[PDB]
């Protein structure tokens, strides 16, 4: 009786716990798929930005050289501490 009631209770408890944990696993798998999608999109965009940044820096170097060739007192300077933040044509001495 005692152990019989305990057996019934244990059966029900184990059943419910298995169901709960399986639901949690399904939720986590869906969230992981979404995370992978977002990571892939971010990787694509970041690679594009990095290639553009390097090429644009080299082009800026060449254009500043050319401006010094044709006797123009202007320079091409980054507006901020990167290229992605913007560049502009300024005048110096």
């Amino acid at each position: 009786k005692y152990i019989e009631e305990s057996q019934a209770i244990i059966q029900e408890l184990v059943k419910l716990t298995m169901e709960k944990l399986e639901s949690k696993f399904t939720k986590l798998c869906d969230l992981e798929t979404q995370l992978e999608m977002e990571k892939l999109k971010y990787v694509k965009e970041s690679e594009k930005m990095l290639n553009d940044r390097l090429s644009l820096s080299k082009q800026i170097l060449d254009l500043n050289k050319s401006l010094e060739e044709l006797n123009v007192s202007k320079k091409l300077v980054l507006i901020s501490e990167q290229v992605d933040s913007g560049i502009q044509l300024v005048e110096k001495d």
Partner: protein, 310 residues
Amino acid sequence: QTNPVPVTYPTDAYIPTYLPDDKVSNLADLKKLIEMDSRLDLYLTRRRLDTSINLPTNTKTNKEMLRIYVYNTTECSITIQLRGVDGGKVQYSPNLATLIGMQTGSVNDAVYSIYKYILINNLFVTEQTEAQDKPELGEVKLDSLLQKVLDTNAAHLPLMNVVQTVNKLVSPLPPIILDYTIDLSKDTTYGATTLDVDVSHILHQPQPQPNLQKEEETDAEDTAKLREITKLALQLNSSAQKYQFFHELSLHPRETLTHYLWSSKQNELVLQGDQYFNEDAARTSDIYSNNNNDRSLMGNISLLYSQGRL
């Protein structure tokens, strides 16, 4: 760690599979729980691995400013630091700032950008590059820009040299420097002498959370729980073995009883094999006497003498 650290207490135990399935009705639930525990362990250990991608950028995710006034009053360099400056953000050399597109960042960002530049322009010496066109393999062919950056007139530096030069090309953020030499003629100045410097990175103060106070507690708690479970499993094994012995006895009494008698006799004989080795039998002339019916001690003498050991 590269080895599993042998320990002194039992770390696991089998669960007996010879119990009757009819009488024991909660073994299936225990095995299901063990499987679920293993699955949770797998999931945690997998998702606790670092797989985050971080490409080099800046301006990562206000009005707060500061004004500094200087004035000589009557009736020379000046340097100023800000203590919010770590090695996490450094000043790239003016040459490196043309290779990469940025001027201030971290060191690993500079290393990653150097490697990405060496990748974009095909500069690694490969089998295909050698076959198309002596330098070794896996070496970097330098351009004019890479040579202006590394300050080497060579052409085939390896990669370690490149990254060590990267280490050379980094300096901390420069402090605030003013040159207000002297003023003695005018009464007071209170000139412009104003500097608008951001202090945003100091008033926000993004700090980490306290650690190493619950990690040890969690480890100790988990170890204690695992050891309790293992002890209970060993107790289950003991009970199951006693049941199996009595069941086997109920099946074949004569054979088990004969085995018991023989094993008891043999184990008693074994446990009495070291009684005359206690410095009492050794220091007295009893065990060396010939009157002993069993002469397993003195009989060796001859052989021991012929071997010279004695």
